[PDB]
Amino acid sequence: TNLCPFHEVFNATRFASVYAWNRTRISNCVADYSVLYNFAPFFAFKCYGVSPTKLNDLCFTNVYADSFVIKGNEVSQIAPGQTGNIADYNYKLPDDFTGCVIAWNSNKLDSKHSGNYDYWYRLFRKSKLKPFERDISTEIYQAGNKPCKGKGPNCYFPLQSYGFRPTYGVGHQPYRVVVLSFELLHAPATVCGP
Amino acid sequence: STIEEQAKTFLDKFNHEAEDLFYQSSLASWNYNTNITEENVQNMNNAGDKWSAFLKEQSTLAQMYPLQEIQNLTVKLQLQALQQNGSSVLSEDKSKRLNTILNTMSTIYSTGKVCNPDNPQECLLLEPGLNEIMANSLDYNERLWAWESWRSEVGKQLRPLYEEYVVLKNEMARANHYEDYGDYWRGDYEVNGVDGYDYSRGQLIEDVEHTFEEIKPLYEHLHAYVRAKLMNAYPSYISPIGCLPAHLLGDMWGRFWTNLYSLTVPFGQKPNIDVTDAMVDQAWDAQRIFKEAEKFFVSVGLPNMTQGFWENSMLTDPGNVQKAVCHPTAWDLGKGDFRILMCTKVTMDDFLTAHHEMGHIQYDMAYAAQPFLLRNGANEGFHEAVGEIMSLSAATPKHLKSIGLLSPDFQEDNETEINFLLKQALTIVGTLPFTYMLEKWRWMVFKGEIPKDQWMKKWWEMKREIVGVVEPVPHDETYCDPASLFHVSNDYSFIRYYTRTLYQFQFQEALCQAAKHEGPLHKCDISNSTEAGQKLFNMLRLGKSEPWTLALENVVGAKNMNVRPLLNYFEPLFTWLKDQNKNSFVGWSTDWSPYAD
Ligand SMILES: *[C@@H]1O[C@H](CO)[C@@H](O)[C@H](O)[C@H]1NC(C)=O
Ligand SMILES: *[C@@H]1O[C@H](CO)[C@@H](O)[C@H](O)[C@H]1NC(C)=O
Ligand SMILES: *[C@@H]1O[C@H](CO)[C@@H](O)[C@H](O)[C@H]1NC(C)=O
Ligand SMILES: *[C@@H]1O[C@H](CO)[C@@H](O)[C@H](O)[C@H]1NC(C)=O
Ligand SMILES: *[C@@H]1O[C@H](CO)[C@@H](O)[C@H](O)[C@H]1NC(C)=O
Ligand SMILES: *[C@@H]1O[C@H](CO)[C@@H](O)[C@H](O)[C@H]1NC(C)=O
Ligand SMILES: [Cl-]
Ligand SMILES: [Zn+2]
């Protein structure tokens, strides 16, 4: 009757930024899923490859949970086969993904007056990302012709800040996002429902 | 490789940085204006200084992108609106001279004081002293004293300062490839590279002249009626064919004739619409007023107010402990935050002003999705027009009866509507010749058609020719009387009000046609018509990314300013007025003056 660290993943304090999406590996559990329901009033529960009521009757070999914070529109942006600055330069989700996404509103823990500048995201990369990629770049971008060195007039630092403050609109408000991925492949499933 | 995509990049960086910096600056301004202290002044000063430094830095950097190699229209507009260096093209010495002169104008106008000739220690400001004096006193001598003392006290100081102001402004205009500063201000309505929608810098002059040509006849008819009423009131001061004295127009400069209603009312025995008693009887408060205006905007299909708007905006005078300046202003701080600040009182006037401000808020929220450099009206004249059209719609007695503030037994009749339209004319018709006068005078002063030693001579000659107002006291070229106005002394364009006057009635006629309403336009209401709301939104979402002509056509289907809505809206008052004016002289003679006997 060993349970997952679901409380330990949905109740942290320092969810990393989207340019470095923290990955927790889930195995050797029995998987309580009433906690996936009772936790917070929620804002989005779009499940794709699994029925969201028919999940306790399934067995999985390995499950991955990735948690990070984004703005309001980007929550709708995270979806199979989409476009935009968060789905093309920070986080890409595969078109054949089978799992559930989680999005609730964090306004009391991850929020402060006088601004919050600890979180970041990436608007600039040479090309498109591939599904499930981590890329902590440090290089300076380039326009099309200049052999520039450092932070040239056409060569910028490709990291910005998520200015967060508690007097912001809902559309720009700092939602907390975690994505749950399963694998329906023939192998000994170490996680099952009671 | 190409330069346009580099511009795209640079703009992509600029929008994101500017959102945060401008939010900080505007939040500092808000917390200053809601709470008047000193450290708040320090904070807003720091924030504005940072914001201005960011602007000058971005302009200096992006100036290296030449506009001749951009094809995307939105990118071109973004980079052009960015690239206007404005004062920085001029030398630093002349720049600091200009800013010192500007601050000097601001201090002289805001702190100008006049003292009565009997008590040297008893002196009055313009606001509220002289404003109340010429807005409430019926004594000819007191109005004359206020007018002459204020002008002789402010214009004489501001004359050479204004001369150097015009000199530097012309220099910087010629630096920025403009022939005159008037052309710099006319550049607001400019669009290029859009076929079937272009507009030249002289086209605005031609259009405003032609429109005034069509709007004049109502104006001399109203002038004749007001002259008859004033001569009835003041037999010994007003000639039956001469121009009206300047200090008998209801405000400090003859800008509005809203005051003269009590003296020029056609039927002084018919009741006036005032639901202030209805406000107190039903115990209405600010929250209920703004919920009323909320559901009014909902009725056409516009969205609700955001939760932050109701939560954090200051909807009442914050007591006596903390002081605030509550001129009705709508603030768009960005990042999905919108606010309203004005001292609500329980009167129908504040009831209309609330609708106007929430119209501003809806306009601002509509184009929130546009980029940072284009989040503004298609031109300058759309914001306040959209604000005022909601007030015009809400002022209709039909809406008042519908929302239970006017008794259904109230009897609408010809006399009451005649009084109402005469009030609306005294508010609206009176200002059009004055705005045309001031703007055209400024334009020909900047262009150089009037040498220095007859500016005021030409000014008053053209007034007696056009607006039909003659000075009661002769002046020499030592005065700078036009600078005695807020807009003239503090660097604002003024044709905006004429443009707004045309635009709001164009919009009203179009929407009222869309609302399938029958009868006089002044009784038209747009509520409960979602088609009107979607028509409004179909231009609301645009911002200023496309030409203003296209935005105007999106609402009215016409590509230019036109005067038919105004004349059609005032036609019954026009026929009443020409009915009365059969036994009075129409027109004004420029030679007669109060000081010539
Ligand atoms: C997180 O844990 C603390 C105790 O460690 C608990 O009080 C709190 O309720 C938890 N968070 C939520 C959202 O329940
Ligand atoms: C998530 O963050 C914790 C604490 O910062 C760290 O120990 C863990 O390795 C991270 N997991 C990742 C980056 O996958
Ligand atoms: C206004 O600012 C002063 C200065 O800090 C402060 O003491 C006061 O509480 C403020 N009043 C408000 C926020 O209503
Ligand atoms: C201009 O660029 C924007 C975004 O880069 C694009 O949506 C639009 O279609 C472009 N228009 C033209 C005329 O190139
Ligand atoms: C928001 O608008 C809807 C649509 O009319 C309305 O039913 C609802 O009451 C509004 N919200 C509030 C808090 O009144
Ligand atoms: C608009 O429709 C509502 C809903 O029936 C009604 O209560 C209100 O009186 C209507 N107003 C007008 C002006 O027709
Ligand atoms: Cl005047
Ligand atoms: Zn307004």
Residue numbers in the entry:
A (entry chain B): 333 to 482, 484 to 527
B (entry chain A): 19 to 615
From the paper:
To further structurally verify this, we determined the cryo-EM structure of the BA.2.86 S-trimer in complex with hACE2. Consistent with binding results, both the N354 glycan and T356 are located far away from the interface. Surface plasmon resonance (SPR) results demonstrated that RBDs with or without the N354 glycosylation showed comparable binding affinities to hACE2, indicating that the N354 glycosylation does not impact hACE2 binding. To further explore the contribution on hACE2 tight binding exemplified by BA.2.86, we evaluated the individual substitution (including reverse mutation) of N354Q, T356K, K403R, D450N, H445V, W452L, L455S, K481N, ins483V, K484A, or P486F in BA.2.86 RBD on the hACE2 affinity. Surprisingly, all single mutations except for L455S identified in JN.1 displayed, to some extent, increased binding affinities and single reverse mutation of D450N, H445V, and P486F induced an ∼3-fold affinity increase. Structural comparisons revealed that the substitutions of N417K and H505Y established extra hydrogen bonds with D30 and E37 on ACE2, and mutations, including P486F, H445V, W452L and L455F-F456L augmented hydrophilic interactions of the microenvironment, increasing binding capabilities.
The dense glycan shield consisting of 22–23 N-glycosylation sequons per protomer is an essential feature of SARS-CoV-2 S architecture. The transition to the ‘up’ state exposures of RBD for the binding to hACE2 is also a prerequisite for S-mediated viral fusion, directly correlating with infectivity.
